[PDB]
Assembly symmetry: D2
Homo-oligomer: 326 residues x 4
C-alpha cells in the first residue's frame, strides 16, 4: 500500500461542538492522529502518517503557513508517495492555488476539509478524508497540479472555489468543471488543468520567509476610496480590485488605483462576480493605466498569483503575461 | 394599452462600440428615446413615455441617484400604470434592492439592462426592454416588490444578483429562484417574495438628501485591517464585512470590527461566498460583540439594508431584527 | 413535543451493504424502528410513531403504494401533528407530487431519503431524518403542500427533482427554487408554491383503488414509434411524451400521438430537457391536434397530473386548464 | 483568411415565424446562403462555403443525415480548413457525439444553432454563427474532437447537453465543464476531452449506409414494460434504459431486459437523471445479467455509442470497455 502523509492545519474537519444537533462549534480543535483513528479504513488503502503543522481556523490562514506548507511538501517529497492536507474550508481555495504554484514535488497533493464538525450528525469529514487519500494514492492523480477533494469530487486548485456558506457540496470548479468523480474508491478522470502549475512555474519560495504585500478592495455603488488609499499609504506592493461586473471600478477607486499604478503599485482588476473572466478590451483601457486583467481568477485567487508574480517582476505587462499563463 | 414610464439611468443597454464584432464599448451613451425607437413593437403592448434621470455606467451608481429614483417613482406613481428602469448590469442588483425597500408606489417597477451593447451583433437590449414592459404592464406583476427582468425571467430585487461577468443569462435569484418566466409576452408567475418590501417597510427616504455612510471590507488569507480602520477613522456609520465561509473574519479585521462595534459602529457580517446565508450560532458569538448577521444578503445587498436600517436605529438588536424581516 | 408519524416505504435510507467503504448495497431492508433508533436525538424534538407501509426500492414504486399512502395520511390526519415519509430517492419526486395533489390533510407532510446507505461512512440518512422531523414539527411548514427535505433544504413537491445520480445534494427545485433552508434546527421560509395543492385540488383518491394508465415515451434522433403504439394498442388512457427541446416530437411519434389524441387517448407534451417549461404557441399547434403542453412538469411528473386529471375529464381543453392551475 | 465550410441541416437558426415578438415559428426553412448573408461580418474572418445537406427540424433528425454528414466531412476534409454545422438545438447533442466518434478529419468540426428563430427580436443566431466560425478558424481548436459553440462557450461533443427548454444559454457540459470561452473573437482554452474521439476511435462509418437499431425506454413509478418488449419482438440490436436514479430499472423492465441481455440483445444502463454517471457496483449486478453501465452518458448519448459499438462486437464485456474509453 502507498505511503500517504497527512499534513494537518486545522479546519472544521478538526472542529468540535458540544452537540451533534446544534450548529455552534469551534474550529481546529482535533489533533491529526485523532482524525485518522476516526477513519480506521484508511489502513485498507494506504499506510498513513500524520503530522501537525498548525491548528487554526482557516479564516486565520496567512502567508507564514503557506510558506511552511510549500517547503515541507517540497523537501519531504521523496519520503512519501502522496500528501493529504486537512484544512478549513473558508480559505482552502486560496491555499490550494498557492501550493498549485509553489510545489515542486511531483507527487499528488490533495486538500480536504469538512462543512460539518467532527461531532455533528452525518458529519462529512470521514468519507471526505478517506476519498482524499484514495486520490493521493492514485498514481493517475499525478501531474494534475494541487487538488482539492470534497463531496466525492476531485477539483483543480486554480478554479475550485467555495460556492455556498453551509452546503456539504459547496466546493465547485465554477468555470471549467471538475477533473473527475470518485466512486467506490476509484476515480474516472476526464479532465486536467491546461494552465501551468507546480514545477512548470518559475515561482520558488524555498528561500523566501516573506511574501509581497497584496490587499483586496471591494467595489459597489458609492464605494469609498479609503480602503484603497490605506493600502497605498502603507506601501503595499499590489492591490487586487474586486470590481463590479467585468472588472469595473467605482470612479473614486478608479482614480486612486490609476494613480498608484503609475507610481509603481501593481493593480489587478478582478471581479466580485462569482463566475467568469475579468477580460481585457471591455470598458477599461488596461494598457493605458498599466492595469492587469485577472481573467477567471476571483479576488483572493488573483491575490495569490499577484503575490507570487511580484517575487519575479514589477512590470505590469510581465505580470499580465503571468496572469495569462498560470 | 397601459401607460408605462421608462426611467433611464444609463448602462450597456444604452452603450455603444464602434463595431458589432469587437468587445470594446463605452457605457451610457444612448438617449432614452433612442432606446425606445429601436423597439417599435413597444407600441403594441404599452403607451410608453421615456424620461432621462442620469446617463452613467452603473459602476458609478451612488446614493444620490438612488434617492432621486425613489422620490420620482413615489411622487409620479399615479401618473402612470408602471415603471421600467433601464440601468447598467454592474450594480443593478444594488439599486433594485434599494428601491425594493424605499418605493411606496403600488404599481410595478421593473429594472432592465443588457450584457451586450446596443451596437453589438445579437444584442440583447431590445428583447430585454420589450420583456420589461410586458412585465410592468401585467397587473399580476403588482404586489411583488421591485423586479429585475433579464433573459426572459422575472427576478425579485432582494435575491437577484449578477452571477457571471459576461453571460447574457448572468442574473439569477441564486438562493430562492425566480418569480416567473416570460414566454410570448405572457408571464407564468409561481412565486412571490416572503420578505417584506415597498410600502410594508418603515423606510421613508422622501425627506432624505443623504444616506448613512456604510462601507465594505473583504476577508481573505492574511487580510489587512487597514481598510476597516480607514472606514472607522472616517467615522463611518456602518461597515459590512464580506467574510469568508459563513461570515467569518480574519483575526485582525475581527479585532478592529469588534472594537468599532462596542464604540458605536454598526457591523454586519456578510460573506464573499456567492450563495447561502451568513447565519448566527456558527463560529461567531454575535450577541457578545453586537454584530449583525446578514443572512442571504451578499455584501453589497447587506450595505443597502444597513444604510436604511441606520436611518431608523443604531441598536444592533434592532438592526438584527430588520435583517430578519426585510 | 409534537406528535410526528414516520411512514416507512424503504429506500437506501433503509438500505444495506457489507462495508462502509464500498457502494454495493441493497435497498429497502432496514425497518422503521431501527431507523428511528439510529437517530436518538429525535426523542428531544418530536414524538415519533414509526409505521411500516412497505419496504421496497423506490425504483419498484407504483400506484398501489401511492394509493395506500394517500389514504393512510388522509385517514390518520387528525391523530397526529405531522407526517414524515421515508422513501427511496429514485422516485421520491413522483410520490411527493402525487401526494401533493391527493392529500387533504392541512398539516405538514414531509418526505426524506438518503443518497448513501445507512451503513456507509458519513451516511446522510440520520441528519436528513432529523431535519425532516424538524420540518414536519414546524408550525410554519403548514399550508405549503407536500414537502421534500433533503440536504438542509425544504423543497416543494411540485418542482423538486433528482438532479444528480449520486450527489448527497441531488435534490433541487430546478425551476422556481426552494422554500427555505434549515440551520440549527430552524427554517427560514421565504417562498410558498403558487400552484394549487393538497386541500384546494378537486381530486379525491379516497374510493379509488386503481389509477388511469399513463405511459411515457422518449423522443430522440431516429426515434421508434414502437413504444408509442404499444401503449395505444394496450389501450392506455393517456401518454406523456418526453419530447426533445421545447416538447417536440419525432416524425413517427408525432403521427401516432396525433391519431391518438383524436380517438380518445389524451396525450401530454412534456420534455426530456431537465429545466424549463414545455410551452404552447411554439412549433406544435396543440389546439390543432388536441395536445396538452405540460409546462414546467417533467415527464414523470406530467404522468402524475394526467393520471389524476383523467379521473376528472378526458377533454383536452379541460386537461390543459388543470395543467395551468395544478 | 481560412477556408470554412458551413454545412446546413436546418434548425430554428434557419427557422421562420410571422413576428419578432411572437413565438410561433417553423423550423429548418431558411437556406444556408441567407444565413451566411445575414452575418456579413463573416467575410472578414473566414472564407465560408455554404453547403445545404438537408433542411429539417432536428427533432426529425435521424441516422441517414448522420451518415451523410460523417461521410461528407471525412471526404471533403482536406479541401477546407474547418467545418461549421448549423443544426437544430433539440438533437444537437446527439449529432455532435455521433460525429465526435465517427469523423476522422483532424481539423475543427463545430456545430451551432439558435434558441430564438432568425426573425425574432434579439435573435441569437448571428453571433452564434460568428463565434462558431471563429472557433472553426482557430488553430487551437484542433485535436479537441467535435465541438458545440453556443452562447460564447466552446463545449465538447461528449458532455454537452441541452439543459433548458427555451434559454439562449441552454447548452452546458453538465459533468466536466466547457473547454473555453469566447470573448472579442478570441478563445481561452483551458480543457480538452480525455475520452478518445474522432481520429483515435476504431469506428469506420465509410461503407455503412445503415446503423444498428437501438431504442430508449423510460423508467418511472409503475413503469410499463410494453415499450421494452415492443423493441425486442421487433428484434432491436440493443436497448438503452433511461433508468431512475443511479441507472436502476423498474420491476417489469428489469426482467424483460435481463431476458434480452442473455438472448443476444445488448442492453445499456443509463439514467433519466440529468447529471452524473451510471456506475457499476451499486444496486445492479451488471456482470450477473450481462448489463452495461453508461457512465456519464445520458440516454440519447448512450444510444449513439452503442449503435456504433454494435458495429464492432456484441460481447457485453467488450461493450463496457468501449463505454469506459469512448
Ligand atoms: N472556519 C472554518 C470553516 C470550515 O472549516 O468549514 C475553517 O475554515 O477552518
Ligand atoms: N458597466 C456597465 C455594464 C452593463 O451595463 O452591462 C454598467 O453597469 O453600466
Ligand atoms: N434505488 C434507491 C435510490 C435511493 O434511495 O437513493 C431507491 O429509490 O429506493
Ligand atoms: N425544434 C428545433 C429546436 C431549435 O433548433 O432550437 C430544432 O431542433 O430544429
Amino acid at each position: 500500500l502507498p505511503n500517504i502523509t497527512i499534513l494537518a492545519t486545522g479546519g472544521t474537519i478538526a472542529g468540535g461542538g458540544d452537540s451533534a444537533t446544534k450548529s455552534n462549534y469551534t474550529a481546529g480543535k482535533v489533533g491529526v492522529e485523532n482524525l485518522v483513528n476516526a477513519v480506521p479504513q484508511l489502513k485498507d488503502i494506504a499506510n498513513v502518517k500524520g503530522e501537525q503543522v498548525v491548528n487554526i481556523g482557516s479564516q486565520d490562514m496567512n502567508d507564514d503557513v503557506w510558506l511552511t506548507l510549500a517547503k515541507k511538501i517540497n523537501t519531504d517529497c521523496d519520503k512519501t508517495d502522496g500528501f493529504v492536507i486537512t484544512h478549513g474550508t473558508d480559505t482552502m481555495e486560496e491555499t490550494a492555488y498557492f501550493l498549485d504554484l509553489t510545489v515542486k514535488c511531483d507527487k499528488p497533493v490533495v486538500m480536504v476539509g469538512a462543512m460539518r464538525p467532527s461531532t455533528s450528525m452525518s458529519a462529512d469529514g470521514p468519507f471526505n478524508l478517506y476519498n482524499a487519500v484514495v486520490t493521493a494514492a492514485d498514481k493517475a492523480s499525478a501531474n494534475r497540479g494541487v487538488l482539492v477533494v470534497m463531496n466525492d469530487t476531485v477539483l483543480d486548485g486554480r478554479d475550485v472555489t467555495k460556492t455556498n456558506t453551509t452546503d456539504v457540496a459547496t466546493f465547485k470548479s465554477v468555470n471549467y468543471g471538475p477533473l473527475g468523480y470518485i466512486h467506490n474508491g476509484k476515480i474516472d478522470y476526464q479532465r486536467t488543468p491546461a494552465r501551468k502549475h507546480t514545477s512548470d512555474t518559475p515561482f520558488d519560495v524555498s528561500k523566501l520567509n516573506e511574501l509581497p504585500k497584496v490587499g483586496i478592495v471591494y467595489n459597489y455603488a458609492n464605494a469609498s476610496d479609503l480602503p484603497a488609499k490605506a493600502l497605498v499609504d502603507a506601501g503595499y506592493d499590489g492591490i487586487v480590485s474586486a470590481g463590479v461586473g467585468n472588472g469595473n471600478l467605482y470612479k473614486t477607486v478608479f482614480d486612486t488605483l490609476a494613480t498608484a499604478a503609475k507610481n509603481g503599485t501593481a493593480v489587478v482588476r478582478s471581479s466580485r462576480v462569482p463566475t467568469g473572466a475579468t477580460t481585457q478590451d471591455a470598458e477599461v483601457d488596461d494598457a493605458k493605466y498599466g492595469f492587469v486583467a485577472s481573467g477567471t481568477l476571483n479576488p483572493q485567487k488573483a491575490r495569490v498569483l499577484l503575490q507570487l508574480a511580484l517575487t519575479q517582476t514589477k512590470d505590469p505587462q510581465q505580470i499580465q503575461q503571468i496572469f495569462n499563463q498560470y
